[PDB]
From Swiss-Prot, chain A:
It comes from Saccharomyces cerevisiae (strain ATCC 204508 / S288c). Present with 6210 molecules/cell in log phase SD medium. InterPro entries: NA-bd_OB-fold (IPR012340), RPABC3 (IPR005570). GO terms for cellular component: nucleoplasm; nucleus; RNA polymerase I complex; RNA polymerase II, core complex; RNA polymerase III complex. One of its GO terms (molecular function) is DNA binding. The gene is RPB8. Its main location: nucleus. This is DNA-directed RNA polymerases I, II, and III subunit RPABC3. The keyword Phosphoprotein applies.
UniProtKB/Swiss-Prot annotation, chain F:
GO terms for biological process: RNA-templated transcription; termination of RNA polymerase II transcription; transcription by RNA polymerase II; transcription elongation by RNA polymerase II; transcription initiation at RNA polymerase II promoter. It is found in: Nucleus. It comes from Saccharomyces cerevisiae (strain ATCC 204508 / S288c). It holds the Pfam family RNA_pol_L_2. Component of the RNA polymerase II (Pol II) complex consisting of 12 subunits. SUPFAM superfamilies: RBP11-like subunits of RNA polymerase. InterPro entries: RBP11 (IPR037685), RBP11-like (IPR036603), RBP11-like_dimer (IPR009025), RNA_pol_Rpb11_13-16kDa_CS (IPR008193), Rpo11-like (IPR022905). This is DNA-directed RNA polymerase II subunit RPB11. Changing L111P: Transcript termination readthrough. One of its GO terms (cellular component) is RNA polymerase II, core complex.
UniProtKB/Swiss-Prot annotation, chain G:
One of its GO terms (biological process) is transcription by RNA polymerase II. DNA-dependent RNA polymerases catalyze the transcription of DNA into RNA using the four ribonucleoside triphosphates as substrates. Common component of RNA polymerases I, II and III which synthesize ribosomal RNA precursors, mRNA precursors and many functional non-coding RNAs, and small RNAs, such as 5S rRNA and tRNAs, respectively. Pol II is the central component of the basal RNA polymerase II transcription machinery. RNA polymerases are composed of mobile elements that move relative to each other. Component of the RNA polymerase I (Pol I), RNA polymerase II (Pol II) and RNA polymerase III (Pol III) complexes. Component of the RNA polymerase I (Pol I) complex consisting of 14 subunits: RPA135, RPA190, RPC40, RPA14, RPB5, RPO26, RPA43, RPB8, RPA12, RPB10, RPC19, RPC10, RPA49 and RPA34. The complex is composed of a horseshoe-shaped core containing ten subunits (RPA135, RPA190, RPB5, RPO26, RPB8, RPB10, RPC10, RPA12, RPC19 and RPC40) where RPA135 and RPA190 form the DNA-binding cleft. The chain holds residues 72 to 155 of 155 of the full protein. It is found in: Cytoplasm; Nucleus. GO terms for molecular function: DNA binding; DNA-directed RNA polymerase activity. Present with 6090 molecules/cell in log phase SD medium. Residues 40-61 are annotated as: Leucine-zipper. Belongs to the archaeal Rpo6/eukaryotic RPB6 RNA polymerase subunit family.
UniProtKB/Swiss-Prot annotation, chain J:
Component of the RNA polymerase II (Pol II) complex consisting of 12 subunits. This is DNA-directed RNA polymerase II subunit RPB2. Zn(2+) binds at C178, C181. Signal peptide: none annotated.
Length: 133, 773, 146, 263, 65, 114, 84, 164, 36, 188
């Protein structure tokens, strides 16, 4: 029962650095020129290219072990394509006037930079990451 | 005297050893045939009448058996020959000499044993085939391999004797050793190579294989961790599963060259609550390194949990490696076509520099360097040129090799490998040398009859241009063999000399022990150290820590520690502290804060005198930074709200704690001073770590977390004091001799030759030097 | 214009030559003459080998069944090494060899082959791989002056 | 017939090149293993030596004897000596053979498996006949005799399985491949300059469609379509090695359902 | 001593191909590689078995007793 | 000498059963079965099939030490669904699967010339 | 030469050597059917029982710590704090 | 040589300095030469350092020497081990070597491992001088059937008439 | 002397026969009793 | 006596590195090649970098080519044979020129993510076998415990163990002693 962030980004770079399945994207945000994003993505399961336009929603719902099927016929809280799930080892840098946060997806890292998220994001593990089209 | 030399070695066996990925760190596989030979006398008691009665029935030929039953009268009934072997009625108080069984504590040892860690206690695991089996990580403390090594197993014979082994010698209690205040056991070879390949970002595991991996970790809790990727494919991270082998409450932070909180290179290491958040896992994290994962798990969870840790990790990685595979072939030693050309030119450039200096010398234009001969300095430059070549040639090959290159994969993980190796295999082998010089003119004015007289070129005097891959010319081959023989000869020497030095050191210190007064004395009762190690601490409880007070500019020192309640700018902002606003301009508190600052400034002076160098990292007990990282995780301290700590809380709190870090207790004046001295360095670390601004601005501790930090520091500290009865002398001798049995190879005297020269107090040194400033 | 795969050799700046080596590989003795590509190994390893070749099992003589000596080890199925040496011909190595040509895999498999140990194929052992005969013979007499 | 599906390419008395499709890799493998280790067979497992003046040692010869493939067509109609209710060996559980040879001529006299002679009663079941496939009906060369030397042995064939000793194995080798076009990406090709140019394209690349340049990785494809080839050693018809392979595997699982049952 | 009965690695029967191999060489003047392939020894594990064998028995038979 | 007889790989010694079923505690609806005298051949098999069942929450196997012939199988299933049954199911499902394969093969065999 | 219960300057904490010897002494006794002072919630292995007695401070033993000069201090196993 | 020194602002900075390295030693005389820093002169001959600067300086040097022999191979050993060695070699006011000085002793007991097939003589002298055996060694106590006053045996255990 | 190795030693030894090359080796071995 | 390869026995190639059998595996369990070829022996790659034993690797490459072509491989020192040369010949035979081959795990059938350097190499069975050194001496009614072993037990502070292990058979005799003169001149 929740959601925490939403917006669409302008991928300005997709670096694969010696990896063969992962790339580090850095897409600017449509709207607010402040909001930025750096993220690790498994390209093998959701390719990405420069100038693309991704919609990024955080959320935190729809820890107990996990089951595979059944739900695939039920709570399809996946109105997206790419779907990760990491933890917030978030260093609220409290840089200058903006506030950046960090997430860890099994090692695939992510970092948002804004300011109005003070009442938006968590300060605790649990947090899914969704992206569509 | 024939018995004062250990001959009649009863109750022990010896055999070839083999490695075993499925044994726990502290076990030893004992072949059934050897188990039936070694016995332990166990008194018949109601707690064990059945087991014994059963063993006696199995007899001397079936494993859970026994060899003799001894009755009250001391009579010995031989179960192998005896008309009543199968008709015995044990009675309380009798003794049954049973075979050693699973879990008995036994002493395992590999000679030459010049380490206490070369004689540890293990738990028995009776197994089939002959040969003893060991967990791979118990390998280095024994300095053992499996190309034929043999080890001895001794069976403790009494009850107090069993206890001594398992309570003092057991492998787990030796993970962290005092010889170098760090673990002496870590993850190696296959498991090391595998753990790295498993931790890369590109490594993902599918559901089918994840469930197996999970199930392989015995301390797992049937809770399938949610995938790092849920999208079109439930995929798990390699880091995710390894994290299951690490227990809860483990935190770890380390920054490498260019590591950030986004470490692009997947550099560094960041584990939080037993979940690796970022960084590839290799030798710096899982090796026997200082602050690594094993040092931490031990100190934080205790010896047993750490021992189990080696096995859990081994089982996961070894499984992930069995199904991933790893290999190496000739292919891995082949460098890029263009690279080889860059290499040939690099060497060709070296032969020119050498050719020039020769023409120079032949015209008589070279100037000798003071206190040196023309020929001496000539040789010098030629050798510098030729090594510069081998080296730069080697770097060109190293850079080339891709991340697929198996040789490079092993080097990146930490498991066997090194530049020099890749350099000699792929690029130039280099200059040979005997007695520190190039190959000498053994024939009149020439190295081999194949050259002309007076030929000082690199090919003549021993430079091997080819790599091992290319092969050596015959002349290169012979020169490389001349150099080779040298190493074989003195390897024999170094060996012999070190073994006698080690036995002389032990003999000189054997009787030195730590008494109950914390004094270190010899058999006579003479004082050697008025307090062991000048600090009363046990070396296995010491860690390298950074004494901040000592580094950087003064502006920085002041920005960091200065708290001026009487200045709008240099006060504690009311957001870091609850009572922040009403503290502004508080005269009485400011008096407390000035005492704290004057003390911090004295400390800095003091430290700068002791470590005139400027060095800040020194081994000290109680790892404060770790204690604080724990507090912040334990009390989920939010870095957003202001703390409820008072300035009196901190200042007076830290002040009180210092009066509790006790090494000595005597009530008189002398001892109390000795006590203040012994705790001086640690207290400087303490005061700089718990300075008011630091506690509120950096750590953000709440009154609860803070009070927790203070009591932990006291607990750990007291747990770090050395125990009276410590055979510190033998400990010392062995700690110096053991590594001196590892030295093998700018013009002075080092290595064993110099060490022997020292211990001998020779009035005729070989290299009497003076250094004048 | 030169083979980049070959090793780097020096030049023939001579008009003085009085002799020429029959063949450079003849600087080696018997044991080392059995090492394949010895010129591609680090020097001390050649020495180690030369020691071990003397601890191998072969067919010391074809008349082993008729001699009655203290100890003897005869390999069941000796094989001539796929990788030979030219000197190896005068040493009769192909005639009276030691060892066999094992199909070898350099790999990290179950973990049971670390720190210098090996994983051997049990099925190959059943079919005869590396079996050997061992003969020990005891001697004894009768009295002396009494 | 809905399910695993065989599709034979080659077939002869020795090999059976085929293509398993629509199956789990796990099953292809278990079957692959079973053929190598658990298909019953008859083989010499005891040799009594009356006379050996040959140049070889008894155990040396005996070892070879066991390696000589024997007729194991009706092996099921034979019981394991361990189950049999006799005392040691009998016609119900064993085949006895004899070997008598004498160096008569001055030329070296050879001894082959053909020279083996059954002495027990085969009761009509094709079993124990030494297999012969060479172009001269000689069989395996067991020993060589100089004039004057002799060899009088007595063997005893028994039912067994590879797990116990590789002599009882009916299989010689078992080719096995899948995804010849590295599409599932199960392996990561090692290379110097070009993955493709440096790695030999396999036979089975012809029986499949090379992936297309721009297709994104197919992450839901599993492993079906396994290209196998079974080589029989003779103790049993190739077709049988496979068939009984599936059979034993089948009986195995069966022995388990029956375990839960009487449990 | 004599032709191993089988290929150590795979099990292939090989002890019934020694004489043939010998003939393929003498009376047919073929080369070992071509000879071996004609006897069906296609994989190197089986090839090495025959190509590397040393028939020392032919020398043992030369002793009188 | 210390080497055990080879038949001990497939022959149940005395006092041993083909299966030992134990209830898992760490989790609900979980069982741990010990197969004596069996290896990866059956292990990876029953595991793979067990995984095709959707009402199955967990399935993994492992032979703790190559010296001994036995493996452990842990199955976790949906409430109401007995793990013991999923096994029976996986088994039968396998047995059938093979029967078909057997046929198809003997069928294709005949259509071959040689 | 004995030192009064007050004025002892030796450690309030038990040393690993004392723990090792006490457990071994006590275990020996339990191995010889000597009376036990705790409830064996299933234990049968002497040392294991001894460890239980220690944790519950029910081992009626005293440690005599000698000083290099000859004097000594007496600490009851009960007194000694066990943290190692 | 480069030298870490405090700069005027406080942070350590490298300040290169010319240093003289010699072949031969005469500390007392060179130490006195004008133009040098007698405060920092050094020599690897800890024997001369002792004779000119005293035993405490001798000790410090001996530690620096031993320590270098171990750092030369990159190896590391906790300070206290080398320190204990250095204190033993220094306790009696002079540099007492360790590589076996005495033909009889170092710190033993006229009972421990009978050295030289003529232990008799070791005992004859012990008698003639009234040698007092402390009995702290392991062998002496083995000969006496007792456990050595070390580690696990550096204290006695006794019954307690307190336990209720 | 030929049975011992007593000349004026170890000069005489039992011939190695472990392997054929080991025998050839022993027969061409050299010894140096007792600057570099 | 016939001696069959067992765990603990020593083996070595001709490049100065021996090893003992750690465990034996049956064919089914071994890893395999597409052609169904299985290894008679598996050694560890970690024993390659540091030994600098490149010849072992080249002997392998050479030996593969020789077996595939029935020609004797020339591994003679100081000749013009090359890895490039050998790699070319092996390639002509349809194999990946540097000795690697795709392999599948024997417990699963699934490929290995890595390819394996596979080929024949000459190995020697050494003497001195397990069953010859297994000596186990336990009398109730190396392998020694000497000075070095004792120093280790002293360092551990294990005093009673040292007492138990170093004490001889001799009977524990009871004597009386004067407290004034430390002599056994007491009449009891
Ligand atoms: Mn070794
Ligand atoms: Zn019968
Ligand atoms: Zn083969
Ligand atoms: Zn008296």
């Amino acid at each position: 029962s929740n959601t925490l962030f939403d917006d669409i980004f302008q991928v300005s770079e997709v670096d694969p650095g010696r990896y063969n399945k992962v790339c580090r994207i850095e897409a600017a945000s449509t709207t607010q020129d402040q909001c930025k994003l750096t993220l690790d993505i498994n390209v093998e399961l959701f390719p990405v290219a420069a100038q693309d336009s991704l919609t990024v929603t955080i959320a935190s719902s729809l820890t107990r072990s996990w089951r595979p099927p059944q739900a695939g016929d039920r709570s399809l809280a996946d109105d997206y394509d790419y779907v990760m799930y990491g933890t917030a080892y978030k260093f609220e840098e409290v840089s200058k006037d903006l506030i950046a946060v960090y997430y860890s997806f099994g090692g695939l890292l992510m970092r948002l930079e804004g300011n109005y998220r003070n009442l938006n994001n968590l300060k605790q593990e649990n947090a899914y990451l969704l992206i569509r089209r | 005297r024939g018995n004062l030399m250990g001959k009649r070695v009863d109750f022990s066996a010896r055999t070839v050893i083999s490695g075993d990925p499925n044994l726990e760190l502290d076990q030893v596989g004992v072949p059934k045939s050897i188990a039936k030979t070694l016995t332990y006398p166990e008194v018949v008691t109601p707690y064990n009448i059945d087991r014994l009665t059963q063993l006696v029935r199995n007899g001397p030929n079936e494993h859970p058996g026994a060899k003799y039953v001894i009755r009250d009268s001391g009579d010995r009934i031989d179960l192998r020959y005896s008309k009543r072997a199968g008709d015995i009625q044990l009675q309380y108080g009798w003794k049954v000499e049973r075979h050693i069984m699973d879990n008995d504590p036994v002493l395992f040892n590999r000679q030459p044993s010049l380490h206490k860690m070369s004689m540890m206690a293990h738990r028995v695991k009776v197994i089939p085939y002959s040969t003893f089996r060991l967990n791979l990580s118990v390998t280095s403390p024994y300095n053992a391999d499996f190309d034929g090594d043999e080890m001895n197993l001794h069976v403790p014979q009494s009850e107090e004797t069993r206890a001594e082994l398992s309570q003092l010698c057991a492998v787990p209690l030796q993970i962290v050793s005092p010889q170098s205040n760090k673990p002496c056991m870590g993850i190696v070879q296959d498991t090391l190579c595998g753990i790295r390949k498993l931790t890369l970002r590109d490594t993902f595991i599918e559901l089918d294989q994840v469930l197996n991996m999970l199930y392989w970790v015995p301390d797992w809790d049937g809770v399938i961790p949610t995938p790092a990727i849920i999208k079109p494919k439930p995929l798990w991270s390699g880091k995710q599963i390894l994290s299951v082998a690490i227990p809860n409450g483990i935190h770890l932070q380390r920054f490498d060259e260019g590591t950030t909180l986004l470490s692009p290179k997947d550099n560094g290491m960041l584990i939080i609550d037993g979940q690796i958040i970022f960084g590839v896992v290799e030798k710096k994290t899982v090796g026997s390194s200082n602050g690594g994962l094993i040092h931490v798990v031990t100190r934080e969870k205790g010896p047993q949990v750490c021992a189990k840790l080696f096995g859990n990790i081994q089982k996961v990685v070894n499984f992930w490696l069995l199904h991933n595979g790893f290999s190496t072939g000739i292919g891995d030693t082949i460098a890029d076509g263009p690279t080889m050309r860059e290499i040939t030119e690099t060497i060709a450039e070296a032969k020119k520099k050498v050719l020039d200096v020769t023409k120079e010398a032949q015209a008589n234009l070279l100037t000798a360097k003071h206190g040196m001969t023309l020929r001496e300095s000539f040789e010098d430059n030629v050798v510098r040129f030729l090594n510069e070549a081998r080296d730069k040639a080697g770097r060109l090959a190293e850079v080339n090799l891709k991340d697929l290159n198996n040789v490079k994969q092993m080097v990146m993980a930490g498991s066997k490998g090194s530049f020099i190796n890749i350099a000699q295999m792929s690029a130039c082998v280099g200059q040979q040398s005997v007695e520190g010089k190039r190959i000498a003119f053994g024939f009149v004015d020439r190295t081999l009859p194949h050259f002309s007289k007076d030929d000082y070129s690199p090919e003549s005097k021993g430079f091997v241009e080819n790599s091992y891959l290319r092969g050596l010319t015959p002349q290169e081959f012979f020169f490389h063999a001349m150099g080779g023989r040298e190493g074989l000869i003195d390897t024999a020497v170094k060996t012999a000399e070190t073994g006698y030095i080690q036995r002389r050191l032990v003999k000189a210190l054997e009787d030195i022990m730590v008494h109950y007064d914390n004094t270190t004395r010899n058999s006579l009762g003479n004082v050697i150290q008025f307090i062991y190690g000048e600090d009363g601490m046990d070396a296995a409880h010491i860690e390298k820590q950074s004494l901040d007070t000592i580094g950087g500019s003064d502006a920085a020192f002041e920005k960091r520690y200065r708290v001026d309640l009487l200045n709008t700018d240099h006060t504690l902002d009311p957001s870091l502290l609850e009572s922040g606003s009403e503290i502004l301009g508080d005269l009485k508190l400011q008096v407390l804060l000035d005492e704290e600052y004057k003390q911090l400034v004295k400390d800095r002076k003091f430290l700068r005198e002791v470590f005139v160098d400027g060095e800040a990292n020194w081994p000290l007990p109680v790892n404060i930074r770790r204690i604080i990282q724990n507090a912040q995780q334990t009390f989920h301290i939010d870095h957003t709200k202001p703390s409820d700590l008072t300035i009196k809380d901190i200042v007076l709190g830290v002040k009180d704690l210092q009066e509790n870090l006790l090494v000595l207790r005597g009530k008189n004046e002398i001892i109390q001073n000795a006590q203040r001295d012994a705790v001086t360095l640690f207290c400087c670390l303490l005061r700089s770590r718990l300075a008011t601004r630091r506690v509120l601005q950096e750590y953000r501790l709440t009154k609860q977390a803070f009070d927790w930090v203070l009591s932990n520091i006291e607990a750990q500290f007291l747990r770090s004091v050395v125990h009276p009865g410590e055979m510190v002398g033998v400990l010392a001798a062995q700690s110096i001799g053991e590594p001196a049995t590892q030295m093998t190879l700018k013009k002075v005297t080092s290595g064993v030759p110099r060490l022997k020269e020292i211990l001998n107090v020779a009035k005729n040194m070989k290299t009497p030097s003076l250094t004048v400033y | 214009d030169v083979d980049p795969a070959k090793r780097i050799r020096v030049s023939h700046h001579a008009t003085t030559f009085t002799h020429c080596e029959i063949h450079p590989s003849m600087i080696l003795g018997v044991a080392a003459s059995i090492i394949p590509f010895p010129d591609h190994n680090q020097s001390p390893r050649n020495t180690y080998q030369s020691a071990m070749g003397k601890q191998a099992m072969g067919v010391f003589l074809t008349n082993y069944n008729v001699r009655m000596d203290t100890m003897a080890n005869i390999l069941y199925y000796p094989q001539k090494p796929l990788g030979t040496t030219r000197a190896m011909e005068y040493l009769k190595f192909r005639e009276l060899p030691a060892g066999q040509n094992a199909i070898v895999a350099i790999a990290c498999y179950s973990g049971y082959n670390q720190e210098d140990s090996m994983i051997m194929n049990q099925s190959s052992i059943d079919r005869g791989l590396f079996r050997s005969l061992f003969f020990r013979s005891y001697m004894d007499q009768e009295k002396k002056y009494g | 017939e809905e399910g695993p599906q065989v599709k034979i390419r080659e077939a002869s008395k020795d090999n059976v090149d085929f293509i398993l499709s629509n199956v789990d890799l796990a099953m292809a493998n278990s079957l692959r293993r079973v053929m190598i280790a658990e298909i019953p067979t008859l083989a010499i497992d005891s040799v009594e030596v009356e006379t050996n003046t040959t140049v070889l040692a008894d155990e040396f010869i005996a070892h070879r004897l066991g390696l000589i493939p024997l007729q194991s067509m009706d092996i099921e109609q034979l019981e394991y000596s361990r189950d049999c209710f006799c005392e040691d060996h009998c016609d119900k559980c064993s085949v006895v053979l004899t070997l008598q040879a004498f160096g008569e001529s001055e030329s070296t006299t050879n001894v082959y498996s053909k020279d083996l002679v059954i002495v027990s009663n085969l009761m009509g079941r094709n079993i124990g006949h030494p297999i012969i496939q060479d172009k001269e009906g000689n069989g395996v060369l067991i020993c060589k005799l100089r004039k004057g030397q002799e060899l009088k042995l007595t063997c005893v064939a028994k039912k067994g399985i590879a797990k116990e000793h590789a002599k009882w194995g009916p299989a010689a080798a078992i080719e096995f491949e899948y995804d010849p076009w590295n599409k599932l990406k199960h392996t990561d090709y090692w290379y110097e300059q070009d993955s493709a140019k440096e790695w030999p394209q396999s036979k089975n690349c012809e029986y499949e469609d090379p992936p297309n340049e721009g297709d994104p990785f197919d992450y839901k494809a599993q492993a079906d379509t396994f290209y196998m080839n079974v080589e029989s050693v003779g103790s049993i018809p190739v077709d049988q090695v496979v068939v009984r392979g599936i059979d034993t595997l089948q009986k195995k699982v069966a022995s388990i359902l029956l375990a839960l049952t009487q449990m | 001593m004599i032709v191993p009965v089988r290929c150590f690695s795979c099990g292939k029967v090989v002890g019934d191909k020694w004489e043939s191999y010998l003939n393929l060489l003498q009376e047919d003047e073929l080369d070992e590689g071509t000879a071996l392939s004609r006897l069906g020894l296609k994989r190197y594990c089986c090839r090495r078995m025959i190509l590397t064998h040393v028939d020392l028995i032919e020398k043992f038979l030369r002793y009188n007793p | 000498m210390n080497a055990p007889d080879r038949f001990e790989l497939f022959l149940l010694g005395e006092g041993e059963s083909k299966l030992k079923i134990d209830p898992d505690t760490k989790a609900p609806n979980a069982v741990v079965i010990t197969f004596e005298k069996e290896d990866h051949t059956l292990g990876n098999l029953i595991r793979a099939e067990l995984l095709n069942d959707r009402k199955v929450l967990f399935a993994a196997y492992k032979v703790e030490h190559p010296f001994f012939a036995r493996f452990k199988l842990r199955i976790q299933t949906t409430e109401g669904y007995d793990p013991k049954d999923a096994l029976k199911n996986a088994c039968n499902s396998i047995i059938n699967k093979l029967g078909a394969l057997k046929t198809n093969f003997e069928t294709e065999w005949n259509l071959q010339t040689l | 030469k004995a030192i009064p219960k007050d004025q002892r300057a030796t450690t309030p904490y038990m040393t690993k050597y004392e723990r090792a010897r006490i457990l071994g002494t006590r275990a020996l006794q339990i191995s010889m059917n000597a009376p036990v002072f705790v409830d064996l919630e299933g234990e049968t292995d002497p040392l294991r029982i001894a460890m239980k007695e220690l944790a519950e401070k029910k081992i009626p033993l005293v440690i005599r710590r000698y000083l290099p000069d000859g004097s000594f201090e007496d600490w009851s196993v009960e007194e000694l704090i066990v943290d190692l | 040589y480069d030298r870490k020194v405090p700069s005027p602002t406080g942070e350590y900075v490298k300040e290169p300095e010319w240093v003289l390295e010699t072949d031969g030693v005469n500390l007392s005389e060179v130490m006195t030469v004008p133009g040098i820093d007698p405060t920092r002169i050094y020599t690897n001959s800890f024997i001369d350092i002792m004779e000119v600067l005293g035993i405490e300086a001798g000790r410090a040097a001996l530690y620096k020497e031993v320590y270098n022999v171990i750092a030369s191979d990159g190896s590391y050993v906790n300070y206290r081990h080398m320190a204990l060695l250095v204190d033993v070699m220094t306790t009696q006011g002079g540099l007492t070597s360790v590589t076996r000085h005495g033909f009889n002793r170092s710190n033993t007991g006229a009972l421990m491992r009978c050295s030289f097939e003529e232990t008799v003589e070791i005992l004859f002298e012990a008698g003639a001088s009234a040698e007092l055996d402390d009995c702290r060694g392991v062998s002496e106590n083995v000969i006496l059937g007792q456990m050595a006053p070390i580690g696990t045996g550096a204290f006695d255990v006794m019954i307690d008439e307190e336990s209720l | 002397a030929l049975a011992t190795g007593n000349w004026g030693a170890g000069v005489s030894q039992v011939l190695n026969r472990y392997t054929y090359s080991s025998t050839l080796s022993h027969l061409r071995r050299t010894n140096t009793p007792i600057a570099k | 006596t016939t001696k069959i390869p067992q765990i603990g026995d020593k083996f070595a190639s001709r490049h100065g590195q021996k090893g003992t059998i750690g465990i034996t595996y049956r064919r089914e369990d071994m890893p395999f090649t597409a052609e169904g070829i299985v290894p008679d022996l598996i050694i560890n790659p970690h024993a390659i970098p540091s030994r600098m034993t490149v010849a072992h690797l080249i002997e392998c490459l050479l030996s593969k080519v020789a077996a595939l072509s029935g020609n004797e491989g020339d591994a003679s020192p100081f000749t013009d044979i090359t890895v490039e040369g050998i790699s070319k010949l092996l390639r002509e035979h349809g194999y990946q020129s540097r000795g690697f081959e795709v392999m599948y795990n024997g417990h699963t059938g699934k490929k290995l993510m890595a390819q394996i350097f596979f080929g024949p190499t000459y190995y020697q069975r050494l003497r001195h076998m397990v069953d010859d050194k297994i000596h186990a001496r336990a009398r109730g009614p190396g392998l020694r415990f000497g000075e070095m072993e004792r120093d280790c037990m002293i360092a551990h502070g294990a005093a009673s163990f040292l007492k138990e292990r170093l004490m001889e058979a001799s009977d524990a005799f009871r004597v009386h002693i004067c407290g004034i003169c430390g002599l056994m001149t007491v009449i009891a």
